[PDB]
Design a protein around this ligand. Structure first.
Ligand SMILES: Nc1ncnc2c1ncn2[C@@H]1O[C@H](COP(=O)(O)OP(=O)(O)O)[C@@H](O)[C@H]1O
Ligand SMILES: Nc1ncnc2c1ncn2[C@@H]1O[C@H](COP(=O)(O)OP(=O)(O)O)[C@@H](O)[C@H]1O
Ligand SMILES: [Mg+2]
Ligand SMILES: [Mg+2]
Lengths: 142, 369, 57, 369, 57
């Protein structure tokens, strides 16, 4: 853990130094930002890392859906007759709750590491107990 | 982030959920002035609490409101609650779920009224008292074994296997921590010193804190320190004197291992814990011997782990491995476990929200724990 | 503090010495039992050969 | 490759058709917790099955759902089916014909409902229950003789000549394997030990597993071990104690050879098997005496073969050769034969496809077997 | 004097601990050898008792 933390913080400090050699002193206040993010990941033998990255990638799609919904909402409002189903973001919220919302999935790992005698199988046993059928997005492959 | 605040008679310790160290810990003394006021304009405080009170014991009388895991003279213990919440930890209870601690079975009425007092005036959102030992177990990450916390007010054992709190063998004992101090009073009268008052009676536990190591083969070590002057130790009071303690040094803690000195006719802790071992199945003894965990306070005395190992291995059949778990995280393991338990998300559903109490009446704590 | 540390190092040395003496005591008892268990096994093999030889006849 | 799964009360054994060894075998215990849950967040399993359940008997109650070849409390036996199929052998039944086992004649309603429960929920393709003894016969490659399987739940004999299952002499007896254990409880109370609970009651069959050898001339051997201390044997429980068993060692299995001890007024197994011999023609006795085959479990006790030979040759006219076939493949011969039977291609046409059951109603098992 | 005296006892503790670990490792292999010797003696008793029963028959 210590090694990981020291490496990460080292990297960010190098980012600070890159800012340093590029420093400015003009009145700059309004920026247009380009962000690069890891792409959606689906392939063989995917552990935790993939779950994390996929969650990050899809939250941005949640952001997109809400944004386009806002603009089209006002536009259709000018032509106001009736909207189908507000908040396009629900389509993703249905799984956002499963991944994050307290005692969802990600929370279960937080709780499980704390709990004594962390054993891998008990993790899945708890998940099956807690979010099968109870959660309409948690099922088993074959 | 709810809260966790220990109840134990000795040191009311306060902290926050999840944090690995109690934010503030202080002795549970409550003090009142025992002389008239002489220098007009002092603006005297009518009562004192905690280390502030311990600061000026000189003109103070000390009431411990918590004896033998029973909360007596509730007025001052409420005063301690109030001082804790606002001055030490410094948040209004109105925005923090709270968890307390309680010895195995103390009385029935205790919880059933304490929940009320801390839940009606402090107006806390939610609370759940958890029996000491199961919490101590969590604190060490071992979900199977016997707990011997012996928190200063009371000493007790539970068998817990595979995470089941097997009730009927719970073997409580009132060989409290304070009573070692009180007996040390009587044993220290003999060397010619005298400690009549209450303030000195508080000092002596401090002098107990350093100079009490339990020793194997009590007879041989006793005759040893009697014949030779090797361990004649010294110490000083905040008075100027220096005091020389002889074999009382290792005659203090052995009241634990046999109570014939204090008088109480209930076997020493090692025999009680062996008893509670032998009052379970013939298959749980395989593991129970292996995960023996000390806890609470009053076991920071050096050696006590080893002496305990000797006594048990003598008592138990010499085919089991009795390697006892005594981490030096003791005296706080209660609180560490409490914080971890408060950190468990699944645990969130358990404790009692105000609605249930209001609509159900006080007994809800017993009915639902 | 140095006097307190010197007492802890004395206690440490003494308790580990006492444990080492108990290990040595148990080790000889295991060797005494080991000879008995081997002699019983050799005697049982000898006694088997007597019965097994008679059984063939 | 269909399947073969034994029903017998003791050890539900699972494997595959053709294979010479059951893939997985486990005791048929079903367990429930008998204490409240104390360490929040365990995620307790609401029931347990098989060696997993046997692992933690400490806080468990044991129900055997299979007594005397009758399947009682069907809920848990269905639980055992479910655990078998998915966890031990690990294939969905949807793609595997299945064969079961059944004692000679237990009740009428048993099969007539068990086929339904295992054929309607598990949705198996096809099934056919086969009476124990005829299966045991194939297992040894001898198509003529008398079978004495005495599977732990029930003991019985059949005469089978030239591959004909001659019904009327089938001589069932409820001198089960478990009841030897239960009697051993009562006989072991006398030497001063005590085994009240259920977990210890499970242990004792284990302690029976090694220390019960049946001896000829019971009177003389009994007085022998009484006079001399020669066979005084020792053993240890997973507790630390060591237990010394005297003549109970060879007084255990002899309840089989005479039931006067257990009380039941039905002659010992040797007399019953001789009876079933003498209830056939005067020409089948020529061969029947010669091919006597033990089977099932509860006959791995050393010596029992020889003692049996002595009793029969004493009873039968001393002009026949009673050489009894007791291979050490016992305790599994049921399952070996079952696999071989499932391997027979001509046998494929026999068992019941779903169509017949659906169009005919439940009685099809009795009508067609 | 106190720090010098502590240094002698912690050095004595370390060498006696090294001997105590050597005794423990030797004790555990002798324990396994004793269990193995008991098992072969017990199996040899069973082998002797079985042939003794067979001879009488
Ligand atoms: N240096 C020390 N050595 C041994 N015991 C001590 C020392 N200092 C304090 N103690 C004991 O620890 C006790 C506190 O234990 P207790 O109050 O029962 O647990 P908790 O403080 O968690 O409620 C005090 O009564 C005191 O006797
Ligand atoms: N070492 C042993 N010696 C003799 N009998 C044993 C031993 N171990 C187990 N058994 C007996 O075997 C029995 C199993 O037989 P049973 O269940 O009737 O046949 P199956 O297991 O094929 O259904 C157990 O009840 C037990 O009493
Ligand atoms: Mg305290
Ligand atoms: Mg069986």
């Amino acid at each position: 853990a210590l090694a990981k933390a020291v490496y990460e913080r080292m990297f960010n400090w190098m980012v600070t130094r890159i800012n340093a050699t590029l420093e400015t002193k003009q009145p700059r206040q309004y920026f247009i930002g380009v962000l690069d993010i890891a792409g959606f990941e689906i392939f063989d033998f995917n552990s935790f890392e993939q779950l994390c990255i996929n969650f990050t990638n899809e939250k941005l799609q949640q952001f997109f859906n809400h944004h386009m919904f806002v603009l089209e909402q006002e536009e259709y409002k000018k032509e106001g007759i009736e909207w189908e189903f507000i908040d396009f973001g629900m389509d993703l919220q249905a799984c956002i709750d499963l991944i994050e919302k307290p005692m969802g999935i990600m929370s279960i790992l937080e709780e499980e590491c704390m709990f004594p005698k962390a054993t891998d199988m008990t993790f899945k046993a708890k998940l099956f107990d807690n979010h099968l059928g109870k959660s309409s997005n948690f099922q088993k492959p074959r | 982030t709810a809260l966790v605040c220990d109840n134990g008679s000795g040191l009311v310790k306060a902290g926050f959920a999840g944090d690995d160290a109690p934010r503030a810990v202080f002795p549970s003394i409550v003090g009142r002035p025992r002389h008239q006021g002489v220098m007009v304009g002092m603006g005297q405080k009518d009562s004192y609490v905690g280390d502030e009170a311990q600061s000026k014991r000189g003109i103070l009388t000390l009431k411990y409101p918590i004896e033998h895991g029973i909360i007596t003279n509730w007025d001052d213990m409420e005063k301690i609650w109030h001082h804790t919440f606002y001055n030490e930890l410094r948040v209004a209870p109105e925005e923090h779920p709270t968890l307390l601690t309680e010895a195995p079975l103390n009385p029935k009425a205790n919880r059933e009224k304490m929940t009320q007092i801390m839940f009606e005036t402090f107006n806390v959102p939610a609370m759940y008292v958890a029996i000491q030992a199961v919490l101590s177990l969590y604190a060490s990450g071992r979900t199977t074994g016997i707990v011997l916390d012996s928190g200063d007010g009371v000493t007790h054992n539970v068998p817990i296997y595979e995470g089941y709190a097997l009730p009927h063998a719970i073997m409580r004992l009132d060989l409290a921590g304070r009573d070692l101090t009180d007996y040390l009073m009587k044993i220290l009268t003999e060397r010619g010193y005298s400690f009549v008052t209450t303030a000195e009676r508080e000092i002596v536990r401090d002098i107990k804190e350093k100079l009490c190591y339990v020793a194997l083969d009590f007879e041989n070590e006793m005759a040893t320190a009697a014949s030779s002057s090797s361990l004649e130790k010294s110490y000083e009071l905040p008075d100027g004197q220096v005091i020389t303690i002889g074999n009382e040094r290792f005659r203090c803690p052995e009241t634990l291992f046999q109570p014939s000195f204090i008088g109480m006719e209930s076997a020493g802790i090692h025999e009680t814990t062996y008893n509670s071992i032998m009052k379970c199945d013939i298959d749980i003894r395989k593991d129970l011997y292996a995960n023996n965990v000390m806890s609470g306070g009053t076991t920071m005395y050096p050696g006590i782990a080893d002496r305990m190992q000797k006594e048990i291995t003598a008592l138990a059949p010499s085919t089991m491995k009795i390697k006892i778990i005594a981490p030096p995280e003791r005296k706080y393991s209660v609180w560490i476990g409490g914080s971890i338990l408060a950190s468990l998300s699944t645990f969130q559903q358990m404790w009692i929200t105000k609605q249930e109490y209001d609509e159900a009446g006080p007994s809800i704590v017993h009915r639902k724990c | 503090e140095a006097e307190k540390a010197a007492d802890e190092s004395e206690r440490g040395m003494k308790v580990i010495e006492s444990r080492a003496q108990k290990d040595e005591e148990k080790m000889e008892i295991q060797e005494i039992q080991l000879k008995e268990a081997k002699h019983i096994a050799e005697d049982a093999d000898r006694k088997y050969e007597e019965v097994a030889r008679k059984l063939v006849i």
